[PDB]
């Protein structure tokens, strides 16, 4: 019954960092293996293609890390406010906690507008 914190790792489509993201997840799993998530959950949204994504939990069970798949997405609208809100509402439904944090992996260009 963890209720204190959800760490949400958000990995929208990056074109060419997908493999790097898998290694990021593997690295984070090596921490879950140490049984640190008694009051917290780790929830991950990852685009496996530009149009396909999965939401899953990293948890510690029977002395090991485990991926619990929560749902899949087809054509998620992750570049839109409504799409991001809907994903975050999914995170909250699967993981009701007092606090939330967000880890965002992708290419970055600061404040620069998409439309220039």
């Amino acid at each position: 019954v963890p209720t204190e914190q959800t760490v949400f790792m958000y990995l929208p489509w990056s074109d060419n960092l997908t493999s790097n993201f898998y290694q990021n997840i593997s690295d984070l799993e090596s921490v879950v293996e140490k049984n640190i998530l008694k009051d917290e959950r780790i929830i991950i949204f990852m685009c496996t293609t530009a149009t396909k994504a999965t939401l899953f939990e990293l948890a510690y069970e029977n002395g090991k890390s485990v991926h619990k798949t929560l749902k899949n997405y087809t054509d998620p609208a992750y570049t839109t406010a409504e799409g991001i809100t809907s994903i975050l509402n999914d995170v909250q439904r699967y993981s009701p906690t007092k606090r939330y944090s967000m880890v965002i992996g992708c290419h970055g260009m600061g404040w620069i507008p998409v439309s220039n």
Binding site: N16, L17, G105, C106, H107, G108
Partner: peptide, 4 residues
Amino acid sequence: VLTX
């Protein structure tokens, strides 16, 4: 060598 690639960056993000």
